[PDB]
Amino acid sequence: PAPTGTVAAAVTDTQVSKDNKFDDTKTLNNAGANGSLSNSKGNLGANIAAGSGNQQDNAAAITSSAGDAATVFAVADIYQESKDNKFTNKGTQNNALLNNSANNSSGNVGVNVAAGQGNQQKNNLAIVTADGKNVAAASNTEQVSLDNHFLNEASSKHSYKPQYVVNNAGLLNSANNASGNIGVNVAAGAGNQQSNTLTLGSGCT
Amino acid sequence: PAPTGTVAAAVTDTQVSKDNKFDDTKTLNNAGANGSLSNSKGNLGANIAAGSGNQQDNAAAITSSAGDAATVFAVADIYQESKDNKFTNKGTQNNALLNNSANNSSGNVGVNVAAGQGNQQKNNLAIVTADGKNVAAASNTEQVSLDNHFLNEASSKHSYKPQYVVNNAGLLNSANNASGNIGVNVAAGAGNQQSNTLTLGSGCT
Amino acid sequence: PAPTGTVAAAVTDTQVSKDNKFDDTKTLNNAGANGSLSNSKGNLGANIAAGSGNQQDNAAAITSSAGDAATVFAVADIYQESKDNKFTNKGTQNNALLNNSANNSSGNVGVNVAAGQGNQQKNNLAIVTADGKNVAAASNTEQVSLDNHFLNEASSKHSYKPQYVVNNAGLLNSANNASGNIGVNVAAGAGNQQSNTLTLGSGCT
Amino acid sequence: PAPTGTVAAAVTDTQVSKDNKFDDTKTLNNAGANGSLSNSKGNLGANIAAGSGNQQDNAAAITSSAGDAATVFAVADIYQESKDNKFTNKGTQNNALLNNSANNSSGNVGVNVAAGQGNQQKNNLAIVTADGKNVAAASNTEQVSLDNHFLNEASSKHSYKPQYVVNNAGLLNSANNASGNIGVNVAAGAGNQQSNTLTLGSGCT
Amino acid sequence: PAPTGTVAAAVTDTQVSKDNKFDDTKTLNNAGANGSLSNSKGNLGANIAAGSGNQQDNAAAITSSAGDAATVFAVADIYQESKDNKFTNKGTQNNALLNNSANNSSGNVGVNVAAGQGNQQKNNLAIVTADGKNVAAASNTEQVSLDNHFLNEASSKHSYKPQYVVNNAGLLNSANNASGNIGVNVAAGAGNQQSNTLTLGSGCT
């Protein structure tokens, strides 16, 4: 038979991971994770991980605005694996913002970013000014993961003023006034695998 | 017979998972999960998980506004699996908002986001400006899951002021003034599988 | 059969790594990591690592502005590996900014930069003024990693004024008003592998 | 078969290294490392290492401005290796700037520069005024490294005024208003390997 | 077979070295190392070493300005080796500038210069006025090195005014408004190997 095998364009990702804890212990936290994509015009993957043993794949393809326009053809592929223990603080006062993402953005974004260990990733993005054949894709993803807990923990001796903690926590608002394709997908804790694909056209006259 | 097998376009997801608890222990919580999709114009999947051992698939295809218009064709596929123990806090005071989603959004959104561990996902989205052949889809999904409890737990010694807890909990309002196709599907607790597909056209003159 | 083997153009990276801790101990920190890509027009990989045992690959290809335009063809390849222990401070007061990246940039950027040890990398970038065949790519990546924790730690004797710490922490905002393809992917802690590819055209008349 | 072996043009670098610490001890530091590439027009590799056991390779090829234009063809190759202990200060007051790089530069730059020991490197650069065939490259890199920590450390006897330290730290901002291809990749600490390639054309009329 | 062996034109350098310390002890330093290449038009290698056991190779080939133009062909080769102990001061007050390099230069420069011992080097440079075949090169470099630390150290008896030190330190800024190919590569500390090649043409009408 004919050498048709070059027709095997797309498989997004495949992965394994296994692990325990994200934590924190004493006095001040002005502290919180992410929040995503307000007023943006395009394709956005927000992927974030506070915690360890991390892997991800993202793909994204765009038409941005209206006018004279061109051709588009995109492809992506990976496999990746990890195993891990913890994320932890003791006793730092924390003016500690973990990473708010991609407001008023245009085109393609992978915000794919971490605090933690044993990190791997694959990022892949494309803009055109294109109209006509718009949305085509094929075959996509596979995955596995095995694990425990997001957590805060604290203990101390019976001093005159024991157990002193002060803390304040945002986690993950999404997509307000967004236009396009928005994938927000974030974790807190270990053992993270994520897969994505996005395809678009929009404008005005 | 003819090589017709390329006609096998669509199967959404298949999965297994099994696991125990989402919890919390001492003093302040100003704290609550999500809430969804007020005044939005499009296709939205809200998927959220506080708790571990997580997997999801989302697909979404759109026509947004009225005017000159184009062709649409979308496809998606995955299988994925996980197993896990807990989500937990001890003794953090919590200004702790878990993630309110996708109000005043347009086009396509997957808000697919977690606090917890052993995470896998596949996200897939598409806008066109398109009118004519609108809604077609085929064959779709398969699933399994096996588990225990969402939970709050607390105990302490007989001190002068024992058992001190203060807490406040929103869970999941949906779709107020929304137009389009809205899938809101969220969990609190472990062992999460979710599947989705959405297809649309709307506007005014 | 014919000597077709020169058709083997692309594989992005493959890697292994395994390791423990990013930390810090006594008195002042005015200190924080990165933040990325505001108002930029192009292809940007932000890769940053505070912590050790580091490896990365980046590729990026661009069309910048509109006018008379030319041909584009880019290729990249590596394998690399590392293993490590820690990142740590004791007792320095710290006016200590770790590296904010690539605002108001144009064309291609790899900001690929570290504080820590056992460092390897491969960077690869290209601009053209090009219109026509825009987005093509093939076959891409492989990866592995195995590890522990981001961490702050502190202990001291019972002096008249014990446990003196003062600290303030930014981590990683992304992509505000950006146009083009933005990959932001940063770590804090050891054991870092990252892979990227970006492809574009945009302008105005 | 024919003597085709001269077609073996490109392999960028291959390396090994393994090592411990960058540090500092008593009284004044007005002190900080690098910062990179503001307003530059071209191909820049910033490679810097405070710390020992160092190796690097850089390649870079350019078109600068628009007008009558010529042909381009570039090639590079190395292997290199090192092993080391430390970087350290005791008790110098320090008006100590480590090396800010390549602002308002044009053409090609390798800023490849160190403070520390067992140093090896290979630098390679080329400008043309060229338009037509722009971006071609092939086969690229290999690497390994194995190590410990960036660090500040301090101890002293119980004098009338013990533990006197004063210090102030910039590390590595990048690419502001840059045009072209920018690789910024710097380390602090020992055991450094880095690899790079860049290719371009830009101008105005 | 034919006597083709004369086709073996290029190998840049190969080397070994191993060693300990750069230091300094008591009272005044108005003192600092190098800084490089502001407003220059050409090919520059800055190589500098405060510290011992030194070896280097540089090659550089140029087209300078536009007009009637000629042919170019350059070649270079060496191997060299060294082993050493220290660089050190005690008690000199120091109006001590170590060597700022090659600002407003044209054509080719090797600034290749030291303070320290067991010194070897090879320098090689060429200008033409040439246009046409511009950038060709082949096969390049090999290297090894093994070592310890850059360092300041000080101790003294308990006199009425002990530990008197006063010091001020520039290290290595690069390439501001430079045009051409700039390799800046400098060390402080022992055990130094460096390799370079540069190729160019630029002008105006």
PDB file of N, CA, C and O in Angstrom, chain E residues 128-164:
ATOM      1  N   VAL E 128      39.411  43.738   5.482  1.00  0.00           N
ATOM      2  CA  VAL E 128      39.341  44.106   4.067  1.00  0.00           C
ATOM      3  C   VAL E 128      38.266  45.181   3.863  1.00  0.00           C
ATOM      4  O   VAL E 128      37.386  45.379   4.697  1.00  0.00           O
ATOM      5  N   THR E 129      38.284  45.860   2.724  1.00  0.00           N
ATOM      6  CA  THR E 129      37.060  46.427   2.133  1.00  0.00           C
ATOM      7  C   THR E 129      36.511  45.391   1.148  1.00  0.00           C
ATOM      8  O   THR E 129      37.043  45.295   0.049  1.00  0.00           O
ATOM      9  N   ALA E 130      35.523  44.567   1.526  1.00  0.00           N
ATOM     10  CA  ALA E 130      35.041  43.425   0.721  1.00  0.00           C
ATOM     11  C   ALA E 130      33.508  43.272   0.680  1.00  0.00           C
ATOM     12  O   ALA E 130      32.857  43.252   1.718  1.00  0.00           O
ATOM     13  N   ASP E 131      32.919  43.041  -0.491  1.00  0.00           N
ATOM     14  CA  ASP E 131      31.495  42.704  -0.609  1.00  0.00           C
ATOM     15  C   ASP E 131      31.290  41.583  -1.643  1.00  0.00           C
ATOM     16  O   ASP E 131      32.119  41.396  -2.539  1.00  0.00           O
ATOM     17  N   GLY E 132      30.227  40.791  -1.488  1.00  0.00           N
ATOM     18  CA  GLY E 132      30.054  39.483  -2.133  1.00  0.00           C
ATOM     19  C   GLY E 132      29.998  38.339  -1.109  1.00  0.00           C
ATOM     20  O   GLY E 132      29.235  38.408  -0.144  1.00  0.00           O
ATOM     21  N   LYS E 133      30.795  37.278  -1.301  1.00  0.00           N
ATOM     22  CA  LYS E 133      30.893  36.133  -0.371  1.00  0.00           C
ATOM     23  C   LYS E 133      31.427  36.584   0.994  1.00  0.00           C
ATOM     24  O   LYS E 133      32.576  37.016   1.092  1.00  0.00           O
ATOM     25  N   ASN E 134      30.599  36.506   2.040  1.00  0.00           N
ATOM     26  CA  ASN E 134      30.833  37.269   3.274  1.00  0.00           C
ATOM     27  C   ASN E 134      31.205  36.416   4.511  1.00  0.00           C
ATOM     28  O   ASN E 134      32.179  36.744   5.181  1.00  0.00           O
ATOM     29  N   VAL E 135      30.488  35.321   4.820  1.00  0.00           N
ATOM     30  CA  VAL E 135      30.405  34.781   6.209  1.00  0.00           C
ATOM     31  C   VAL E 135      31.055  33.395   6.465  1.00  0.00           C
ATOM     32  O   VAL E 135      31.163  32.964   7.613  1.00  0.00           O
ATOM     33  N   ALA E 136      31.538  32.691   5.441  1.00  0.00           N
ATOM     34  CA  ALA E 136      31.932  31.274   5.548  1.00  0.00           C
ATOM     35  C   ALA E 136      32.972  30.934   6.654  1.00  0.00           C
ATOM     36  O   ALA E 136      33.967  31.643   6.828  1.00  0.00           O
ATOM     37  N   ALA E 137      32.769  29.804   7.347  1.00  0.00           N
ATOM     38  CA  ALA E 137      33.635  29.235   8.397  1.00  0.00           C
ATOM     39  C   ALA E 137      33.414  27.704   8.557  1.00  0.00           C
ATOM     40  O   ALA E 137      32.423  27.183   8.041  1.00  0.00           O
ATOM     41  N   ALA E 138      34.310  26.970   9.246  1.00  0.00           N
ATOM     42  CA  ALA E 138      34.194  25.507   9.442  1.00  0.00           C
ATOM     43  C   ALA E 138      34.913  24.920  10.694  1.00  0.00           C
ATOM     44  O   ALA E 138      36.007  25.344  11.064  1.00  0.00           O
ATOM     45  N   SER E 139      34.319  23.873  11.289  1.00  0.00           N
ATOM     46  CA  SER E 139      34.846  22.921  12.308  1.00  0.00           C
ATOM     47  C   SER E 139      35.238  23.413  13.718  1.00  0.00           C
ATOM     48  O   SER E 139      34.956  22.720  14.689  1.00  0.00           O
ATOM     49  N   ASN E 140      35.832  24.592  13.880  1.00  0.00           N
ATOM     50  CA  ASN E 140      35.986  25.294  15.172  1.00  0.00           C
ATOM     51  C   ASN E 140      36.692  24.570  16.370  1.00  0.00           C
ATOM     52  O   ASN E 140      37.847  24.194  16.217  1.00  0.00           O
ATOM     53  N   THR E 141      36.105  24.451  17.577  1.00  0.00           N
ATOM     54  CA  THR E 141      36.875  24.357  18.865  1.00  0.00           C
ATOM     55  C   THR E 141      36.800  23.047  19.703  1.00  0.00           C
ATOM     56  O   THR E 141      35.920  22.217  19.496  1.00  0.00           O
ATOM     57  N   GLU E 142      37.680  22.880  20.712  1.00  0.00           N
ATOM     58  CA  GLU E 142      37.649  21.871  21.805  1.00  0.00           C
ATOM     59  C   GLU E 142      38.212  22.465  23.143  1.00  0.00           C
ATOM     60  O   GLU E 142      39.012  23.392  23.083  1.00  0.00           O
ATOM     61  N   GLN E 143      37.831  22.016  24.362  1.00  0.00           N
ATOM     62  CA  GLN E 143      38.319  22.623  25.644  1.00  0.00           C
ATOM     63  C   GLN E 143      38.157  21.750  26.932  1.00  0.00           C
ATOM     64  O   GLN E 143      37.306  20.866  26.953  1.00  0.00           O
ATOM     65  N   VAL E 144      38.914  22.020  28.024  1.00  0.00           N
ATOM     66  CA  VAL E 144      38.718  21.494  29.420  1.00  0.00           C
ATOM     67  C   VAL E 144      39.233  22.498  30.499  1.00  0.00           C
ATOM     68  O   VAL E 144      40.209  23.186  30.211  1.00  0.00           O
ATOM     69  N   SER E 145      38.690  22.574  31.739  1.00  0.00           N
ATOM     70  CA  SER E 145      39.238  23.358  32.909  1.00  0.00           C
ATOM     71  C   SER E 145      38.754  22.917  34.333  1.00  0.00           C
ATOM     72  O   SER E 145      37.619  22.476  34.443  1.00  0.00           O
ATOM     73  N   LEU E 146      39.500  23.081  35.454  1.00  0.00           N
ATOM     74  CA  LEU E 146      39.170  22.481  36.797  1.00  0.00           C
ATOM     75  C   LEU E 146      39.692  23.260  38.056  1.00  0.00           C
ATOM     76  O   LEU E 146      40.887  23.356  38.267  1.00  0.00           O
ATOM     77  N   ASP E 147      38.862  23.766  38.980  1.00  0.00           N
ATOM     78  CA  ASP E 147      39.264  24.984  39.749  1.00  0.00           C
ATOM     79  C   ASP E 147      38.572  25.295  41.132  1.00  0.00           C
ATOM     80  O   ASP E 147      37.869  24.441  41.695  1.00  0.00           O
ATOM     81  N   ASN E 148      38.754  26.533  41.680  1.00  0.00           N
ATOM     82  CA  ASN E 148      38.065  27.085  42.892  1.00  0.00           C
ATOM     83  C   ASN E 148      37.333  28.516  42.920  1.00  0.00           C
ATOM     84  O   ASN E 148      36.101  28.669  42.923  1.00  0.00           O
ATOM     85  N   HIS E 149      37.974  29.644  43.247  1.00  0.00           N
ATOM     86  CA  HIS E 149      37.141  30.810  43.643  1.00  0.00           C
ATOM     87  C   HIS E 149      37.720  32.197  43.373  1.00  0.00           C
ATOM     88  O   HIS E 149      38.859  32.509  43.680  1.00  0.00           O
ATOM     89  N   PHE E 150      36.898  33.114  42.871  1.00  0.00           N
ATOM     90  CA  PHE E 150      37.115  34.553  43.089  1.00  0.00           C
ATOM     91  C   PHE E 150      36.854  34.895  44.575  1.00  0.00           C
ATOM     92  O   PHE E 150      35.935  34.298  45.143  1.00  0.00           O
ATOM     93  N   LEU E 151      37.644  35.777  45.233  1.00  0.00           N
ATOM     94  CA  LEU E 151      37.597  35.962  46.706  1.00  0.00           C
ATOM     95  C   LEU E 151      38.148  37.262  47.325  1.00  0.00           C
ATOM     96  O   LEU E 151      39.300  37.580  47.157  1.00  0.00           O
ATOM     97  N   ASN E 152      37.484  37.918  48.267  1.00  0.00           N
ATOM     98  CA  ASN E 152      38.190  38.880  49.133  1.00  0.00           C
ATOM     99  C   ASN E 152      38.308  38.381  50.561  1.00  0.00           C
ATOM    100  O   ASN E 152      37.350  37.834  51.098  1.00  0.00           O
ATOM    101  N   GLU E 153      39.488  38.533  51.156  1.00  0.00           N
ATOM    102  CA  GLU E 153      39.758  38.012  52.503  1.00  0.00           C
ATOM    103  C   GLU E 153      40.508  39.016  53.401  1.00  0.00           C
ATOM    104  O   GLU E 153      41.400  39.725  52.937  1.00  0.00           O
ATOM    105  N   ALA E 154      40.175  39.076  54.696  1.00  0.00           N
ATOM    106  CA  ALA E 154      40.798  40.017  55.638  1.00  0.00           C
ATOM    107  C   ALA E 154      40.649  39.605  57.118  1.00  0.00           C
ATOM    108  O   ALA E 154      39.549  39.312  57.591  1.00  0.00           O
ATOM    109  N   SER E 155      41.748  39.681  57.876  1.00  0.00           N
ATOM    110  CA  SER E 155      41.803  39.492  59.337  1.00  0.00           C
ATOM    111  C   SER E 155      42.927  40.344  59.956  1.00  0.00           C
ATOM    112  O   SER E 155      43.904  40.671  59.278  1.00  0.00           O
ATOM    113  N   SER E 156      42.795  40.732  61.228  1.00  0.00           N
ATOM    114  CA  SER E 156      43.782  41.552  61.954  1.00  0.00           C
ATOM    115  C   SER E 156      43.637  41.418  63.478  1.00  0.00           C
ATOM    116  O   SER E 156      42.577  41.033  63.982  1.00  0.00           O
ATOM    117  N   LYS E 157      44.682  41.790  64.227  1.00  0.00           N
ATOM    118  CA  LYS E 157      44.663  41.872  65.699  1.00  0.00           C
ATOM    119  C   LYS E 157      43.655  42.942  66.207  1.00  0.00           C
ATOM    120  O   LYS E 157      43.201  43.835  65.478  1.00  0.00           O
ATOM    121  N   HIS E 158      43.257  42.865  67.472  1.00  0.00           N
ATOM    122  CA  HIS E 158      42.345  43.835  68.095  1.00  0.00           C
ATOM    123  C   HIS E 158      43.086  45.112  68.546  1.00  0.00           C
ATOM    124  O   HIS E 158      43.251  45.377  69.738  1.00  0.00           O
ATOM    125  N   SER E 159      43.558  45.900  67.577  1.00  0.00           N
ATOM    126  CA  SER E 159      44.084  47.262  67.779  1.00  0.00           C
ATOM    127  C   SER E 159      42.959  48.270  68.104  1.00  0.00           C
ATOM    128  O   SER E 159      41.778  47.919  68.105  1.00  0.00           O
ATOM    129  N   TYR E 160      43.300  49.537  68.355  1.00  0.00           N
ATOM    130  CA  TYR E 160      42.340  50.623  68.617  1.00  0.00           C
ATOM    131  C   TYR E 160      41.378  50.893  67.438  1.00  0.00           C
ATOM    132  O   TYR E 160      40.220  51.262  67.651  1.00  0.00           O
ATOM    133  N   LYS E 161      41.836  50.668  66.197  1.00  0.00           N
ATOM    134  CA  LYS E 161      41.052  50.816  64.954  1.00  0.00           C
ATOM    135  C   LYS E 161      41.323  49.628  64.004  1.00  0.00           C
ATOM    136  O   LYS E 161      42.127  49.750  63.077  1.00  0.00           O
ATOM    137  N   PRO E 162      40.736  48.446  64.272  1.00  0.00           N
ATOM    138  CA  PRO E 162      41.035  47.202  63.556  1.00  0.00           C
ATOM    139  C   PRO E 162      40.317  47.120  62.197  1.00  0.00           C
ATOM    140  O   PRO E 162      39.369  47.865  61.945  1.00  0.00           O
ATOM    141  N   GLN E 163      40.710  46.169  61.339  1.00  0.00           N
ATOM    142  CA  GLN E 163      39.952  45.796  60.127  1.00  0.00           C
ATOM    143  C   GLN E 163      39.694  46.952  59.133  1.00  0.00           C
ATOM    144  O   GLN E 163      38.648  46.999  58.484  1.00  0.00           O
ATOM    145  N   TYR E 164      40.617  47.913  59.003  1.00  0.00           N
ATOM    146  CA  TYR E 164      40.402  49.070  58.128  1.00  0.00           C
ATOM    147  C   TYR E 164      40.523  48.709  56.634  1.00  0.00           C
ATOM    148  O   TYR E 164      41.606  48.393  56.137  1.00  0.00           O
TER     149      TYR E 164
END
